Design a protein around this ligand. Sequence first.
Ligand code: LMT
Ligand code: LMT
Ligand code: LMT
Ligand code: LMT
Ligand code: LMT
Ligand code: LMT
Ligand code: LMT
Ligand code: LMT
Ligand code: LMT
Ligand code: LMT
Ligand code: RET
Ligand code: RET
Ligand code: RET
Ligand code: RET
Ligand code: RET
Lengths: 272, 272, 272, 272, 272
Amino acid sequence: MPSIENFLAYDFWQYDVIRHLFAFSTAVFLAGLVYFAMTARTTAPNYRLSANISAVVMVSAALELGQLWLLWNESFQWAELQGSFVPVAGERFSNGYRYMNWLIDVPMLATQLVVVCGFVGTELRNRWAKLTIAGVLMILTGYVGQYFEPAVAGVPGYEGAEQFWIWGIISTAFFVWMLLILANAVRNPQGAPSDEVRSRLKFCFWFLLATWSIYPFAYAMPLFAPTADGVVVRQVIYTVADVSSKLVFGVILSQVALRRSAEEGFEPARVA
Amino acid sequence: MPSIENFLAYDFWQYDVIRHLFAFSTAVFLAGLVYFAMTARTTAPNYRLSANISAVVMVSAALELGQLWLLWNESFQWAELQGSFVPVAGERFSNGYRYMNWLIDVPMLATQLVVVCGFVGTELRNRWAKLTIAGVLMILTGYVGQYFEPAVAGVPGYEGAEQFWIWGIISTAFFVWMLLILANAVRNPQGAPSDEVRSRLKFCFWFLLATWSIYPFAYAMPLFAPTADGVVVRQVIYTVADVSSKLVFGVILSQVALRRSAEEGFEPARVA
Amino acid sequence: MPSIENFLAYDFWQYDVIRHLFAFSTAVFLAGLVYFAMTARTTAPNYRLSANISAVVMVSAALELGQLWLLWNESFQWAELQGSFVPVAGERFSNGYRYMNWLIDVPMLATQLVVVCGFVGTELRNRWAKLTIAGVLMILTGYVGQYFEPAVAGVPGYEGAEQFWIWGIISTAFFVWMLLILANAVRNPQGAPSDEVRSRLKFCFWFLLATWSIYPFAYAMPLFAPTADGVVVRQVIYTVADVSSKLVFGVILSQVALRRSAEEGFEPARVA
Amino acid sequence: MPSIENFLAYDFWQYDVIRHLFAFSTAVFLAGLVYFAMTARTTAPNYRLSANISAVVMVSAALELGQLWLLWNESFQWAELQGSFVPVAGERFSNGYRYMNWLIDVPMLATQLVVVCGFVGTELRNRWAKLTIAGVLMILTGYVGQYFEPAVAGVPGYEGAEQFWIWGIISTAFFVWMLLILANAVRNPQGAPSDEVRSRLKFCFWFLLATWSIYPFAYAMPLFAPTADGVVVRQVIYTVADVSSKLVFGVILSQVALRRSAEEGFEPARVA
Amino acid sequence: MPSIENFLAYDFWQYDVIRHLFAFSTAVFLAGLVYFAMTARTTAPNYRLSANISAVVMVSAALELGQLWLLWNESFQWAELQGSFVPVAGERFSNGYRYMNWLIDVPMLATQLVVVCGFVGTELRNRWAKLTIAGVLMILTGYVGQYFEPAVAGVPGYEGAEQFWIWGIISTAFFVWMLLILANAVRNPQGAPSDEVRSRLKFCFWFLLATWSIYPFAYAMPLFAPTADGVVVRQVIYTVADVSSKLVFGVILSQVALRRSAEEGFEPARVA
Ligand SMILES: CCCCCCCCCCCCO[C@@H]1O[C@H](CO)[C@@H](O[C@H]2O[C@H](CO)[C@@H](O)[C@H](O)[C@H]2O)[C@H](O)[C@H]1O
Ligand SMILES: CCCCCCCCCCCCO[C@@H]1O[C@H](CO)[C@@H](O[C@H]2O[C@H](CO)[C@@H](O)[C@H](O)[C@H]2O)[C@H](O)[C@H]1O
Ligand SMILES: CCCCCCCCCCCCO[C@@H]1O[C@H](CO)[C@@H](O[C@H]2O[C@H](CO)[C@@H](O)[C@H](O)[C@H]2O)[C@H](O)[C@H]1O
Ligand SMILES: CCCCCCCCCCCCO[C@@H]1O[C@H](CO)[C@@H](O[C@H]2O[C@H](CO)[C@@H](O)[C@H](O)[C@H]2O)[C@H](O)[C@H]1O
Ligand SMILES: CCCCCCCCCCCCO[C@@H]1O[C@H](CO)[C@@H](O[C@H]2O[C@H](CO)[C@@H](O)[C@H](O)[C@H]2O)[C@H](O)[C@H]1O
Ligand SMILES: CCCCCCCCCCCCO[C@@H]1O[C@H](CO)[C@@H](O[C@H]2O[C@H](CO)[C@@H](O)[C@H](O)[C@H]2O)[C@H](O)[C@H]1O
Ligand SMILES: CCCCCCCCCCCCO[C@@H]1O[C@H](CO)[C@@H](O[C@H]2O[C@H](CO)[C@@H](O)[C@H](O)[C@H]2O)[C@H](O)[C@H]1O
Ligand SMILES: CCCCCCCCCCCCO[C@@H]1O[C@H](CO)[C@@H](O[C@H]2O[C@H](CO)[C@@H](O)[C@H](O)[C@H]2O)[C@H](O)[C@H]1O
Ligand SMILES: CCCCCCCCCCCCO[C@@H]1O[C@H](CO)[C@@H](O[C@H]2O[C@H](CO)[C@@H](O)[C@H](O)[C@H]2O)[C@H](O)[C@H]1O
Ligand SMILES: CCCCCCCCCCCCO[C@@H]1O[C@H](CO)[C@@H](O[C@H]2O[C@H](CO)[C@@H](O)[C@H](O)[C@H]2O)[C@H](O)[C@H]1O
Ligand SMILES: *C/C=C(C)/C=C/C=C(C)/C=C/C1=C(C)CCCC1(C)C
Ligand SMILES: *C/C=C(C)/C=C/C=C(C)/C=C/C1=C(C)CCCC1(C)C
Ligand SMILES: *C/C=C(C)/C=C/C=C(C)/C=C/C1=C(C)CCCC1(C)C
Ligand SMILES: *C/C=C(C)/C=C/C=C(C)/C=C/C1=C(C)CCCC1(C)C
Ligand SMILES: *C/C=C(C)/C=C/C=C(C)/C=C/C1=C(C)CCCC1(C)C
């Protein structure tokens, strides 16, 4: 079913704020792509893969936000008589456009964290495979669940509110599995890290946890506040979570990777 | 004739999922282009051509999926009364937009496999020529066959279902010729490869065989499930095949090429 | 509420000038992105972050202006009978689209100034954190205030003119806090700068203060000139401020950074 | 006058094929741009200009095909009752959008061939000048002639069929002049080329002659087959000629330039 | 007032040629961007600023022509009954869209000429400042003047023909001031240039003078030939002037800069 955004009329500022959020996020991710591309070579070869993954995540996020921006603009039009933006006839907005891109983002973010933790070769491949399986199952179950949010929001005609809960809970279990893999990786770093590096890797894990925990809250938003205000708040928290989880986490992880490159004698890392 | 996608009405989730699949694949291929471009120079000069071909394939795939996404959005519109996305009056969706880009993708993928296998000069040129001839004939025959899809699906007023079978079978024969060439290349690697390299090249051949085999199934889908559910499944399998056979195959092949560069003494490959 | 631009009819030259301004600013920022990307590596590694932040700012600004240009074109249409561009029925223009991109621009600009001042590590992080907090609060308060501009302009049916003043004043206080932080950074440069560097850093502070001060005037324009002429002058001052405070400030700051790099023995900086 | 494409109704497969051709060629040329930009530095500096020109040609061709694709999509719409794509009311397709871009492509292609032939300095400038004059006159005369193709095709109400022949013949004379310059350049290479280089340069000249000769046939198609089938054949041969004469010719010329760089001692060329 | 292009009906070839010119120029400038970006590092660091300015000019020109192309397509539509492209109801074309981008182009072009003349530091800054002031005043006065071209063309209901003359004459005076500055720079080159460099710098001055002089003629076209043929010829001379004054001028200037770099011992310049 269509997302809860399609069953509401929006005041000008509500709609304006949401479209600004999508534009801004797209700008953030394109600028982050430029930044990571310009700075990747400062990281040592053995960690550069994390810098490259950051670039990849920026590309994915830029496109996902840009398509949300496009769809948001196309799905609603101003109605002067009501003083509100209202659904257009032939288009329907979907918040699910972000979920399929998370298939790229989430595994990549976890993998780059494992990379900076120092895992290589088969250990790296195995942790990447576990993180991809868990993340993909989490995203797909949440993606199924998010198609029932008009039902769970009590919009007349729509049925299947229990599917929302069921698929959300299954996705939560897979989220816990990913968090357990990442905790094991951040606690068992390879390559003889310094105490500062160990603490920074732990902080990176906790930052990832805090930022990723926002997404289930936005998923549950139709249950709590199925209003225009709730939609605005949901888009705001998506914007905070997206920017933090991808760009800010990438910047922090790059700082950790640069510290490890410096501690291993990478001259560009040391001068920078 | 118009593809079977034009003769069905879509529930919101079906149409939504297909548009998300096209957007997601476009994002995957643009991010893959960025990745390959940033990492190509880690491969030794004598294998860098494969890394370059990967970049080329990403470009081709990005545009082919983006045009699919555009056309999908333009060809259908929401209908509130029916609660379904229905075909628009002036536009018709086509699934054949992917076929012509395969003219780039398929020879390039096979070629880069032959490259990493160590064939150079005239031996390389001869394998590239054979792979291009076989692949172009395969793609063109399947392309002709895919225009009789509504006829083979039993849509009234459409004739020529036998053409679907005939051109699909001819394309299958050319596919077998491609596979035979690639098997001879993966079994006769040049440049004195290590046992690990040989096994990884064989795995690459089998991965290509497995991922390319999804395309004839997707081609056959109008026969087995000419429904909206069958269309969704078709697009999902295309997404899996596209992502695997281009991006994941490129990553695996870059790993083999990097290992061969390391074993030949390429220092960037060895440090990385 | 919709910005004051939506409540006026525009002569051809007024509308034409505004759309030319948006397009020209977009061109300026894309060209600046190309320039800074091509020139970043001339700055020494310990100051290259400023060159990178300039690239980031150019990206942000390019998209912010391009989206304003798109919206401006979409929100109004020619009406030959009146000889004027008038609001279209289904779209409303918003000047607030620039405000969310300022979230990127303003902290980045301040930070790159602090970088060229020579602050590193935790001192850098702390100043970046203060400048981001102050700038985000400033931008968000001004963004809230700018939604009441038809009310402050005396357009009938719109209430809440006092919110315009209140949020503008709060934003002014946060602006003063940012200016104080930047004055402390520019007055306490690190790394033993030369007298010429010290004076150029002070000039960069005053240039930032002068260019940033145009934004509150543009914010106040609905109060003084809620006409088509006032809209034109607003957009002209916005263009001047955008170009100066981002591109010209980046060029001047790159010159200071290059001078510091030369002083510290960076050979690319010295030859250039 | 409008091109002959505007006076026909198209079956779905005819229209579909043509749009696929334009999109495919655009993808080819963008991929080619990525490839040439990634590989230009492998050529020695005294031949790198040809690699740069290949990149330029790719850019030009990509845009020329993308605009043809756009216009083709806009100029026609599906009509379900007739089962055909028919011209829209407000738009007309033009095949002349390619001709103006040839002003870039044709001189550049000839010039890069002269470059790889070894001509430098004033001799290079003189051959570039002659090739540009001849090619520009060729393109402009053919461009004038192509505006009379509805007349030459016998579409009622259109006069001036003799202009088609006259301007085509004048363009053919200028084509012969260009071929004569290129033949003299490839028969008198500079810089003491090896026999393989000499033969490969002669091959490149004959390849250019073969691929460029398709364009007058496509120009003459309105005369022989002013039908939808003839339109499809025209676009197909344009696609073959475009791809060959730009991309494949560039690849082959890069191979010659690489061989000459290896024979003059350019290490990157020798390792690759 | 709307440009004279809005008050005429266009034959198919006239409208077709104009849209081809806009597209072709956009392609030229994007290809120029790619060329200058790929070749900038061949110039020595003390002259590489000119190469960077060429890249910047390409960006600006590409966007300006692209927007003229877009606006041209949107402002007119085919009318089968009249056999002509006629103005659409809700859009009006503006030739002034190039003027604001000239704010970037003209100072940059003059400045890069002064750079290759060898002026550095404060002397360079002073000449850049004079050139920017004169050029901005020139462009703004001509921009004001070009808003009266329907009046000067004698279209009924439009007054103010004298403003066209007045602002054109003031802009001509500022053009003369620019030319005087550039003549002083080209006649007093720094860095002890060779006689060949001195003569090539003088030729660059005369080439700039010849190509820039076309713009006042195009500005005067509404007075001489306010017809569809006059519009076509104006766009043609705009295309010639744009290509020559930006791309061709950049190529010639890069040749002078390369010769100076080689004379000063820049090895990449000498090998290339
Ligand atoms: C959407 C586009 C995504 C493209 C890239 C995806 C990367 C996913 C990483 C999966 C982790 C498991 O497999 C891992 O793969 C990476 C990338 O090939 C390999 O990485 C290797 O190549 C890259 C360059 O290609 C080097 O920077 C790295 O130092 C080197 O080890 C690891 O040796 C391997 O262990
Ligand atoms: C609109 C957005 C666009 C621009 C956004 C730019 C993002 C910039 C992010 C800057 C990074 C912040 O810097 C980060 O600060 C935290 C502060 O706790 C530091 O963390 C530090 O303190 C914590 C406290 O618990 C310790 O656990 C950790 O070991 C220590 O290093 C990180 O090591 C550092 O990387
Ligand atoms: C859509 C864009 C496609 C662009 C690239 C197409 C590649 C097609 C490969 C065909 C294989 C046969 O021809 C082969 O061509 C490649 C590319 O010129 C040549 O490759 C040569 O140039 C490339 C590029 O500088 C080097 O990375 C490589 O090391 C070198 O051998 C081979 O020596 C030749 O044997
Ligand atoms: C969705 C967006 C895209 C995200 C990014 C995707 C990146 C994908 C990276 C995949 C890496 C796979 O890595 C690949 O794993 C297989 C696992 O069998 C390894 O293969 C290994 O086992 C097989 C048997 O199973 C042997 O035949 C082979 O010789 C051996 O090396 C490959 O040597 C390795 O290259
Ligand atoms: C919208 C995308 C923006 C992304 C980039 C934002 C960077 C500015 C944030 C400043 C936060 C303060 O924290 C600061 O972070 C930067 C960036 O990691 C670090 O910078 C470090 O890495 C960069 C490359 O990544 C090097 O050029 C620099 O020399 C080095 O010090 C500083 O050591 C740290 O003190
Ligand atoms: C149309 C788009 C816009 C295009 C803009 C193109 C780039 C603009 C480049 C501007 C360069 C300005 O250059 C800047 O000039 C000022 C002039 O006061 C110099 O400043 C100099 O004088 C001031 C006093 O006036 C002193 O306080 C300062 O210490 C001294 O260096 C700066 O050291 C120099 O960096
Ligand atoms: C629209 C975007 C335009 C962005 C760039 C505009 C440049 C215009 C320069 C005009 C003159 C200003 O003054 C001049 O500025 C340039 C650019 O900082 C400085 O140039 C300095 O840095 C650049 C890189 O940033 C080097 O290539 C150059 O060798 C070096 O001298 C000159 O030392 C100074 O004399
Ligand atoms: C769908 C888009 C496709 C994208 C990718 C396309 C890549 C195209 C790569 C083409 C490579 C062809 O490679 C080219 O082969 C011919 C074969 O006659 C060789 O030519 C060779 O044989 C001919 C035979 O008459 C001799 O005249 C010539 O002297 C000799 O060198 C060229 O030396 C080589 O450069
Ligand atoms: C659609 C178009 C896209 C592609 C366009 C490509 C542009 C290529 C431009 C080629 C460069 C022209 O080359 C230029 O020729 C003139 C010819 O007078 C030379 O000039 C030479 O002769 C003149 C007199 O005529 C002397 O004053 C000068 O000192 C001398 O060098 C320039 O030194 C050279 O730089
Ligand atoms: C349309 C996009 C831009 C097109 C740019 C390319 C146009 C080339 C046309 C050839 C004109 C003949 O004149 C020729 O010009 C080229 C390009 O400046 C010069 O080439 C010189 O600069 C280039 C670029 O730095 C170097 O790769 C080359 O090694 C060097 O010789 C030749 O010395 C000169 O003889
Ligand atoms: C950049 C995108 C990111 C980091 C996305 C992260 C997404 C999640 C952590 C998703 C979590 C989910 C659950 C735990 C429950 C509800 C369903 C999901 C998929 C939203
Ligand atoms: C990235 C795109 C790829 C790898 C495409 C591959 C396509 C095939 C292997 C196509 C095969 C076909 C047949 C064997 C039978 C039916 C017709 C085709 C063309 C779909
Ligand atoms: C590139 C964008 C820049 C430099 C934006 C700067 C914005 C400001 C300095 C904002 C100032 C404000 C006030 C001081 C009062 C009115 C509200 C604001 C947000 C416009
Ligand atoms: C990439 C574009 C290319 C190689 C274009 C080439 C064009 C020609 C060789 C044009 C030839 C013409 C004639 C000889 C006669 C008919 C008119 C022309 C312009 C099509
Ligand atoms: C790339 C764009 C360029 C070089 C533009 C140049 C513009 C001029 C030389 C403008 C000249 C003018 C006058 C001298 C009189 C009439 C008004 C102007 C602005 C067109």
